[PDB]
Every structure is written in structure tokens, then in C-alpha cells.
Design a binder for this molecule. Structure first.
Ligand SMILES: CC(=O)N[C@H]1[C@H]([C@H](O)[C@H](O)CO)O[C@@](O[C@H]2[C@@H](O)[C@@H](CO)O[C@@H](O[C@H]3[C@H](O)[C@@H](O)[C@H](O)O[C@@H]3CO)[C@@H]2O)(C(=O)O)C[C@@H]1O
Length: 803
């Protein structure tokens, strides 16, 4: 309708367009309208109702700090260890000219014409954590290790971290490993067929792992097996920093040992000084986490949610009241989510670190010892529907590591992570497979050779062990029985959905989804830690609980969790055909080549981007509430998340063996596989047509690659139409329970170019859509496109008519 206006974004300016493909005025520069500093950048905005506009702004000059050790009581009050450092904010100002810089949620109100009047601003404060002089999350943060982010130029070998020591040498030792079977019963590994099963990966070499107050380096290794220092900050700081500088320099030099990804970091949410719109080192890891934890938002009946970036893991999220001026963040570490079953929740928790009633060490800082759940997630997106919030995220790999000073220790300088893929002898049906004991508490998977046919998963699992096939197949944490009280396992977090980075085919099969059973009814065996997708519907009362958790000043509720019961996990691997060696001795991570075109140099790690909810316009049954489902885009396919509208819960069936109806993955075609997932600038859903539109701006690609060469195909656009498929819930009268999950379908409709810069796209009608282009002076090249079922092509007559 002529009366309705479409809002298009250009940096900070929100220009309102008419269905005549013309602006109604210059637009609204949110930064200036909110009376904020020029360093502020607009990242996410949501049009609320008709008389409201909510936005998300973040300054690159923001500087955060975590105060660790050297303190006493008597004078120290209820102060937060996480606080804004104004000292470095005024120091970082030196860029061009001037004449806490915290993120803000902005509220606007509609005035006559296409104008907005500034109403109020809500401060997005740091999450609360009690300082020191089993209720202490502070210890975890004191000894926390976070990996440098994954760039679209990071190759497969860059993630490949050298395999650790087997659990037979951990519990027994070097020289007496041959007594595995004869003594595994009393050690807690009864019928365990995995002696040479790798416990994790070594941390002495590879991609840098930096603490909260330490900083991520711009240079990353091509092959983490040969080059890189990993956790060793002092080894980098003293000689390897200069090694990476001379070999990998910025444009202003062989590139054989390291890669310069400064441009790639900036185009993710990472603050890179000297490379901004308006050598040295990048800001604190805790500061980068804050700058990346403010990328997405949603508004519900007076509540504003804020979540992290889809490329950088977020350790917290905001839930702030409209009336509130401030509002501290809620941790994911204190947010208990339903993983589908009680066993599915266990797998991830029982890898976060070491926990036993024997240990009570100050250096035993791991989440499990501090009684905390999964702390990080790569938020694919969020949305609101039927007075309820809906989210989807790729669970970031949070594991443990040995902080021992004893170099002779087998687990010394290594992170503990094992393959959690269900055994080959596991019972059929989703529930029976996801609940399988295979690596619940410790390693079990690895290379098992059956005559001449090798298998990367355990052939003996559950309770089918022993002789009579009744004996339990035991599994336990890779820490020696007598070393349990003195154990100092801390917490480590990865920048990908992988728990394990160990250079082996077992971790390759978890990432690519190649673990199957030898049954005629071939079922794909699931990982319960690697390539995991979390999704769920959260209500206003569950949301309020997250706010109250953040607003708490330690006191008694320093351990208390946020209960989100309507959530579930799902094993979502990358396609195998995305990797060159498996097309449509063996191989490991480093030996895996990439043939991936979706704007990723790695054919190993998965990426979930741009989630959007939507109410199916289809006529519903006599009484029943209108059906709704949320859709997101992953590597190699479209995934639809279904929900029950009559109860505002996750859609579940009568039979537990049958795969969940709440989850559905539809793999997409050849044309849509050439689409870069990182270039997504907008996700629009049309209520009247029931179609999703994924608008990819080529300009969202960085300036230079890892080898500091100008990025090609930066000019252009590509659109993906996502439509519903299959039988829906309450499609007719007799439709009660569903056996097959209602899915979606991704197709590159026809709205695509590689020669023009995109201003945006206007959905004029169900039949016609417009394409506004940039580049030259003024900007306003309009192109009218027509469709049928979804096939798009430009109407030469109407395009020439507007122009
Ligand atoms: C993850 C892991 O470490 N798997 C092991 C497995 C498991 O230990 C086993 O499945 C359960 O205990 O054993 C593997 O060992 C076999 C392998 O070394 C082959 C090599 O040819 O030999 C087999 O032994 C045979 C062989 O004929 C002689 O060595 C022996 O005198 O008789 C045996 C037959 O009775 C080993 O069992 C396996 O691949 O199955 C090695 C894995 O690393």
C-alpha cells in the first residue's frame, strides 16, 4: 500500500522509502539523533509497531577490564570485577580529530511525515561478578582461555591442533599401558575398548589462546601443527610476535608462516585500531567480547533482548526493561538450557572440566567445579512471535585444560576434548542414539579396524559390553585416580561450534557427518558436543527471570540458574561434499582440502546465520491458533524450526524413536552453495505470502585477505527465497500427530548482480519487487523485477520507466 513506508539502512542513517521507490526525506542518522559520539556505529535496528523504532549502537572506543588478584576485604564493598576503563577510552581517541563509550538501546517515537523523535536510551552494562580477596564464577574468568576468532580466510590446517595423549597413558602411565584390559575395571573404565583414544589436543602450538585481560594477535598460522604458539603469551610477546610481523605485513612478506587478517577481523565486530571509518596491539579479549556481544536485538511488551555475533562467541546476553536506564547482562554460564534430554545436557557439562568430591583446589577453576553450564554460543539470530522470543545458536566448544607446572605429566600443556559420537552397536531411533553412553564421561572413539574396514566410532557401547552383552561400557574423565585431589583443570572456550580441535579423522567425521552404522537402515551416528545447534521458544516470565539474575548483587543467588525448559539441541554437521577429499593411513584435519564456495576457506567448521520467525498465512483448523516457524541458514542447507501454536512450545511428536518434528534441515542446491553466508545484510519475512528473503550484500566482504591481497567480487548482491514444504501441523481436521518434520526450501530466486552496490530491496507486492543501487553521486538506480512461483528476472520496460 502507498501509505506504508520501507526503511533502508546506510551505515547509521535509516532512509524511509515509498512504494514509488523514492525516499520521503534524507533519512534518520540514529547516532546524531540520540546525541551520541561519532565513533558510534549502528549494527541492528527493529521497527516496533507503527509509533516505535528501537536500535542498537556500539562505539569502537569502548574499553573494558577484569581486575585479577592483589586485594583484601574490610574496605572492598560489593564491587564488580568487570568494569569500564575510561583511562584507555580517552587514550584510544587518537585517530583523526575530536573538537565509557558503552552500547545503548535507543527508543524513538513517530512524528508527522517520515520523521522520528528521540525518546530515551538504555545503557547495556557489564554482567555482574563478585570479586575475591563453591560459589565463585570469578575463578573461572581468572583462568579462562579464549581462542582468536575464525576468519573467512582461515584454512583447514589452521584449526588442526596436534593430538594429545591417549587415556591409557593418563590413568596408567608410560611403560605400563599393556595392563589396560587387566586393570580397567577397578580404574573406572570397565569394558572400555578405547586405550589409544585421544583425550584432546596440545596447547603448546597453534592459534593463540589469550586470557580476559590479554589481547588477540592480528596474525594467525596457516598450519597450526608447524607454526603458532597457542596459549603461550610470553613466547609470542618475546620472539614469535616479531616473526609474524616481518613475514605477514599489512598493506602500506612471503606469507608462508602466518596470515594478516586485520581487515577480516574488523568485518566481524573485532576492534582493529588504525583501520576505522572516522605497529600496536588490539584491545582486551573481555573488551572484544563486549563489542561482539552487542550485534543483535528484539523487543517484547516492554522488554529488550540483546545477543552476540554469529562469527564471534558471546559469553552473555541482555534482557532490559523499557523503564530502566541501566541493565546488567545475564551470563550463558548461569543460564540452564534444555538440551533435549537429561543425557544430552550431561555430555556438554561433563567436558567443561574436572569435578569430584576429592578436589577443592583454588586452581581448579573449571565451570563444572563452579557448578556452571555452557557459557558460550555463536548466536545465529533471534526474533519475536506470539508474545514469545525465539532464538537459534551454534554452541561454541567449551572444554577444560591442565594448568600443571609438572612438564613430565601426559596431560601437561593440553586441552581435554573427546569424540562424543554414538557407538556402532547403539539402538535405532533418535532418542536411543542421542542418549547413547559413547564418551559421556571420557574418551572411547578412535580408529578401530574390522578386518580391512576401519571405523572411527566405538563398536562396543552402552551395556552391550563384556561377554554376555549385559556388562556396562564404562567411561571416565582423563585425570589419574591419585592425581584427582591435586588436579588443576581450568576452563577453555573455542571460536567455533567444535569442542575438539584434535588433528584426526575422528574429529573430521564429527564435523562432516560421516559416522554411520553398517545396518541396511543406515543411521547417521550423532555427536553430542561437536557441531551442535541450540534452538528454543522463551516466554516473558522466563525472560524476566534472566533480568532478575543479572540485577542480583551476588548475596545468596551467586550460583542460581535461569531455567529455559522450551529449548533443544541438534547435531548439525557441515556437508561432506563441501570438503574436496570426499566429493558427491587415511586423512586428518590438516590433510583436508576445501572446495567450499560459500565464503569460507575451511570445509570443517559450520556457520548458522540470520534467523527469522514467521506466521504461516495458510488457513488453520476450526479453533486452532495460526501456525508459526522460524528459519535460519547454515552451511549447505536451510533449517526450519517448528513450534506448537496452541501451547507456544517446541513441536514434539508421540513417538520418541522418530526424529524430532521441531527440527528440519533441507540441503540447498548448487547455485545457493556459491552464496557467501557472511554477506547477509537483511532478513525479511512477508506475512501475506509466507516467504523469507535473505539479502546478501557483496560489500560486506573485507578489503584484504590473509595474504594481504585486494578482495575480488566486493560489488554486487544475491537474494535467497526461503519457502515452506511438506505437511503442516493441523493442515486438515484429522491431522493430529506428525511423523515427518515440516521443512523449508532455499533457492537463489533471480535477484542477483556482481556489478552494482546495493542500497536495499523494496517488496512492492507478491508479484513485484524493486532493487535500489548505490555507487555514483546522488544514488537511486531502481530495477523492477517480476516472479512466478519464485523465479525472478528484471522487467526491462518498468526498469527503464522509473529511471
Ligand atoms: C581406539 C583404539 O585404541 N582402538 C584399538 C582397538 C581396540 O583396542 C579394540 O577394538 C578393543 O580392545 O584394537 C586395535 O588393535 C588391533 C590391531 O593392532 C591389529 C593390527 O593388525 O591387530 C589386532 O590383533 C590381532 C593380531 O592378529 C595380532 O596382533 C594378535 O596376535 O591377534 C589379534 C587377533 O586375535 C589388534 O586387536 C584394532 O584396530 O582393532 C587397535 C586400535 O587402535
Amino acid at each position: 500500500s502507498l501509505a506504508n513506508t520501507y526503511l533502508l539502512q546506510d551505515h547509521n542513517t535509516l532512509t524511509p522509502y515509498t512504494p514509488f521507490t523514492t525516499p520521503l526525506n534524507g533519512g534518520l542518522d540514529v547516532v546524531r539523533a540520540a546525541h551520541l559520539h561519532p565513533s558510534y556505529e549502528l549494527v541492528d535496528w527493529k521497527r516496533v509497531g507503527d509509533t516505535k523504532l528501537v536500535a542498537l549502537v556500539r562505539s569502537a572506543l569502548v574499553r573494558v577490564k577484569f581486575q585479577d588478584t592483589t586485594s583484601s576485604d574490610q574496605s572492598n564493598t560489593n564491587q564488580n570485577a568487570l568494569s569500564f576503563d575510561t583511562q584507555e577510552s580517552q587514550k584510544a581517541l587518537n585517530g583523526s580529530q575530536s573538537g565509557d563509550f558503552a552500547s545503548y538501546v535507543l527508543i524513538f517515537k513517530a512524528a508527522p511525515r517520515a520523521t522520528w523523535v528521540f525518546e530515551r536510551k538504555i545503557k547495556l552494562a557489564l554482567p555482574y561478578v563478585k570479586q575475591e580477596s563453591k560459589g565463585s564464577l570469578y575463578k573461572t574468568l581468572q583462568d579462562l582461555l579464549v581462542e582468536q576468532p575464525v576468519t573467512p580466510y582461515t584454512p583447514n590446517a589452521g584449526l588442526a591442533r596436534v593430538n594429545g595423549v591417549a587415556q591409557d597413558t593418563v590413568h596408567f602411565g608410560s611403560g605400563q599401558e599393556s595392563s589396560w584390559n587387566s586393570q580397567r575395571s577397578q580404574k573406572g573404565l570397565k569394558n572400555n575398548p578405547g586405550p589409544k583414544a585421544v583425550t584432546g589436543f596440545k596447547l603448546d602450538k597453534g592459534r593463540a589462546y589469550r586470557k580476559l585481560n590479554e589481547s588477540w594477535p592480528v596474525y594467525e598460522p596457516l598450519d597450526s601443527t608447524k607454526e603458532g604458539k597457542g596459549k603461550d603469551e610470553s613466547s609470542w610477546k618475546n620472539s614469535e610476535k616479531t616473526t609474524a610481523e616481518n613475514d605477514a605485513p599489512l598493506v602500506g612478506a612471503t606469507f608462508s608462516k602466518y596470515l594478516n587478517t586485520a581487515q577480516a577481523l574488523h568485518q566481524m565486530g573485532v576492534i582493529v585500531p588504525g583501520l576505522e571509518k572516522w605497529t600496536d596491539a588490539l584491545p582486551n579479549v573481555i573488551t572484544q567480547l563486549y563489542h561482539t556481544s552487542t550485534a543483535q536485538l528484539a523487543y517484547l511488551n516492554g522488554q529488550i533482548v540483546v545477543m552476540g555475533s554469529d562469527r564471534v562467541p558471546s559469553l552473555w546476553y541482555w534482557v532490559v526493561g523499557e523503564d530502566q536506564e541501566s541493565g546488567k547482562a545475564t551470563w550463558w554460564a548461569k543460564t540452564e538450557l534444555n538440551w533435549g534430554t537429561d543425557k544430552q545436557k550431561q555430555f556438554v557439562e561433563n567436558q567443561l572440566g574436572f569435578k569430584d568430591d576429592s578436589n577443592s583446589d583454588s586452581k581448579n577453576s573449571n565451570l563444572k567445579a563452579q557448578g556452571l553450564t555452557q557459557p558460550a554460543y555463536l548466536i545465529a539470530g533471534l526474533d519475536v512471535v506470539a508474545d514469545h522470543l525465539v532464538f537459534a545458536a551454534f554452541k561454541a566448544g567449551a572444554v577444560g585444560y591442565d594448568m600443571t607446572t609438572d612438564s613430565s605429566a601426559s596431560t601437561y600443556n593440553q586441552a581435554l576434548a573427546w569424540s562424543t559420537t554414538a557407538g556402532l552397536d547403539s539402538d535405532g531411533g533418535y532418542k536411543a542414539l542421542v542418549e547413547n553412553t559413547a564418551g559421556l564421561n571420557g574418551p572411547i572413539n578412535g580408529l578401530f579396524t574390522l578386518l580391512d574396514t576401519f571405523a572411527y566410532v566405538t563398536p562396543v557401547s552402552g551395556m552391550k559390553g563384556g561377554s554376555q552383552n549385559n556388562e556396562e561400557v564404562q567411561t571416565t574423565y582423563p585425570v589419574k585416580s591419585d592425581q584427582k585431589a591435586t588436579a588443576k583443570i581450568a576452563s577453555l572456550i573455542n571460536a567455533s561450534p567444535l569442542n575438539s580441535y584434535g588433528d584426526d579423522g575422528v574429529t573430521v567425521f564429527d564435523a562432516l557427518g560421516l559416522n554411520f552404522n553398517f545396518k541396511l537402515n543406515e543411521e547417521r551416528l550423532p555427536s553430542r558436543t561437536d557441531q551442535l545447534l541450540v534452538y528454543g521458544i522463551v516466554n516473558e516470565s522466563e525472560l524476566k527471570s534472566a533480568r532478575e539474575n543479572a540485577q542480583s548483587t551476588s548475596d545468596d543467588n551467586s550460583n542460581t540458574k535461569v531455567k529455559w525448559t522450551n529449548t533443544a539441541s541438534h547435531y548439525l554437521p557441515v556437508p561432506y561434499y563441501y570438503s574436496a577429499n570426499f566429493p558427491e593411513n587415511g586423512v586428518k584435519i590438516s590433510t583436508l582440502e576445501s572446495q567450499a564456495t560459500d565464503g569460507f576457506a575451511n570445509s570443517l567448521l559450520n556457520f548458522g546465520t540470520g534467523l527469522k520467525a514467521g506466521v504461516d498465512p495458510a488457513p488453520v483448523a476450526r479453533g486452532h491458533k495460526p501456525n508459526y516457524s522460524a528459519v535460519l541458514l547454515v552451511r549447505g542447507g536451510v533449517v526450519r524450526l517448528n513450534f506448537n501454536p496452541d501451547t507456544d512450545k517446541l513441536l514434539d511428536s508421540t513417538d520418541k524413536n522418530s526424529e524430532p518434528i521441531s527440527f528440519s534441515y533441507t540441503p540447498f542446491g548448487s547455485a545457493e552453495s556459491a552464496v557467501d553466508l557472511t554477506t547477509l545484510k537483511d532478513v525479511t519475512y512477508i506475512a501475506e505470502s509466507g516467504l523469507w528473503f535473505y539479502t546478501f550484500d557483496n560489500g560486506e566482504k573485507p578489503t584484504y585477505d590473509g595474504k594481504q591481497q585486494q578482495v575480488k567480487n566486493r560489488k554486487g548482491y544475491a537474494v535467497i527465497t526461503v519457502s515452506r514444504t511438506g505437511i503442516e501441523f493441523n493442515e486438515d481436521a484429522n491431522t493430529t500427530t506428525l511423523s515427518q518434520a515440516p521443512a523449508a526450501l532455499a533457492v537463489q530466486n533471480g535477484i542477483a548482480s556482481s556489478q552494482d552496490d546495493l542500497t536495499g530491496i523494496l517488496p512492492l507486492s507478491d508479484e513485484f519487487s524493486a532493487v535500489i543501487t548505490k555507487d555514483q553521486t546522488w544514488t537511486g538506480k531502481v530495477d523492477i523485477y517480476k516472479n512466478t512461483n519464485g523465479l525472478f528476472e528484471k522487467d526491462d520496460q518498468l526498469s527503464e520507466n522509473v529511471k
